[PDB]
Ligand binder design. Structure first.
Ligand SMILES: Nc1nc2c(ncn2[C@@H]2O[C@H](COP(=O)(O)OP(=O)(O)OP(=O)(O)O)[C@@H](O)[C@H]2O)c(=O)[nH]1
Ligand SMILES: Nc1nc2c(ncn2[C@@H]2O[C@H](COP(=O)(O)OP(=O)(O)OP(=O)(O)O)[C@@H](O)[C@H]2O)c(=O)[nH]1
Ligand SMILES: [Mg+2]
Ligand SMILES: [Mg+2]
Lengths: 256, 256
């Protein structure tokens, strides 16, 4: 119909959940109806404003590196290590702070980070038991930020999730990022998000936004949980390919 | 209605493309109609038989390791290396043949395979230019199978795909497997499959079937290309977690 047809088109292109498309149009029609006729001028404004109103508050998409400990975990291959290396590098040139590493990736899959840690002249401590990961903290009792890379598996198995909670206890001075790949399938993230309810993820980290066709799926998830994204990884180059997004921002990215 | 309602239910559970569900039911109704009333006995037989008839011929899901050269490539993080290590190991205990390695993963991301290659007492040759990868072949001019791991990127960039075709020329004695993650999104695989048309993939390799909720998406792809799957990777343990599937098999796995 009116600017409502301009919206439907735009919205349909996003991988967004079929229902959501519907609702959002209704919310527009309603504004149109009980506010003041929608003009083909600010449709894309209410549209983005609405979709925006579904995602967590914009104040939950910031909290950049702050705690002495940064912990990344989640999905195999998504980019926990590569991303961690970026963040560290970032806060070493965009903050000059003291970088420190701790890898929990006990189970070959660990020489990657030692060399990187080396290229930046930063110490890394490999830790097997919750005990070891504790001794390692005191060592950096006088360090700025300590990036903790963790081994990745199929958190479907309840064993790997509690094991995660055993090695990395989660005290008051720790930032947890559940690193998921924008490449990921919606009904798949739906479950893993759930399996991680028992653990305190402060923020998400959607990677490979440069590989997935649509960013629909990722909105679908976000639009049903309380924490926003802290960074979005869009490439392999380190440390250039990382970025931070805001609800409006992410949404603008979503509308293609 | 008749056993047609028993089918619809079953089919709807698979992540299979919405259209396909429809068509398949029609094909059933038709059998029902012009063949001999469908009984709630062989519905799941025609059902699997039909879905089966959409996927490539069953003779295109076999061709196990045969050529002197095995090349795996595709999607970042999907499991090219981990899988390659499995295959080699396999053909060393399930065939005693001579294992050989060549890594094209020039651009840290390479010490993983040297140690593994070491644990099996097998030689690996790292190769930068098409020239180097050629010198390496002659070295194993007297070797059984040579597994070639390749670096992974965003084959969206046309640069990485032709570069793949430059280092690994693709002569008559080579087996190419496009390693995709069952974890992957359908419209995403749709494109990468395309970007790889210029290169000769003999077989697919869907990994992480143990991580994705549905296997719908993966059928969706297969049901629109000419080559079947050669192995399916369902875990991290090496070399236990690999398997081979057949259309009927894969389909039976699909119906949950
Ligand atoms: N296209 C693209 N590739 C990425 C991105 N982030 C990481 N990668 C690549 O994905 C692959 C795996 O990255 P890793 O960082 O090793 O993945 P991980 O989560 O630590 O992997 P595990 O330790 O096995 O759980 C590498 O080839 C990375 O360079 C991204 O934003 N975009
Ligand atoms: N759950 C599960 N994890 C797997 C499977 N195959 C591989 N992985 C894990 O996924 C991660 C990445 O595997 P890799 O083999 O390094 O991936 P890759 O394709 O060589 O990665 P790049 O070289 O970065 O392109 C590792 O943690 C693997 O152990 C699988 O079938 N299931
Ligand atoms: Mg890692
Ligand atoms: Mg690899």
């Amino acid at each position: 119909p009116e600017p409502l047809r301009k919206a439907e088109k735009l919205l349909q292109e996003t991988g967004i959940k079929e229902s959501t498309k519907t609702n959002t149009l209704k919310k527009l029609l309603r504004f149109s109806v009980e506010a003041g006729g929608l003009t083909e001028e600010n449709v894309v404004g209410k549209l983005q404003e609405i979709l925006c109103d579904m995602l967590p508050s914009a104040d939950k998409w910031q909290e950049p590196i702050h705690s002495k400990y940064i912990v990344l975990f989640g999905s195999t291959g998504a980019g926990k290590t590569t991303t961690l290396a970026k963040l560290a590098a970032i806060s070493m040139l965009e903050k000059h702070k003291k970088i420190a590493f701790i890898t929990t990736d006990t189970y070959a899959a660990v020489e990657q980070l030692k060399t990187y840690a080396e290229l930046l002249q930063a110490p890394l401590e490999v830790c097997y038991t919750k005990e070891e990961f504790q001794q390692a903290k005191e060592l950096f009792s006088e360090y700025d930020h300590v990036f903790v890379d963790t081994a990745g598996r199929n958190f479907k198995d309840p064993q790997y999730i509690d094991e995660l909670k055993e090695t990395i206890p989660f005290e008051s001075s720790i930032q947890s990022f559940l690193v998921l790949s924008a490449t990921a399938k919606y009904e798949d993230m739906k479950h893993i998000v759930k399996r991680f309810s028992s653990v305190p993820v402060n923020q998400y980290i959607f990677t490979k936004i440069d590989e997935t066709t649509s960013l629909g799926s990722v909105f679908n998830i976000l639009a049903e949980s309380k924490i926003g994204v802290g960074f979005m990884t869009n490439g392999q180059n380190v440390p250039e390919d990382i970025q931070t997004v805001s609800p409006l921002g992410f949404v603008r990215m979503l509308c293609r």
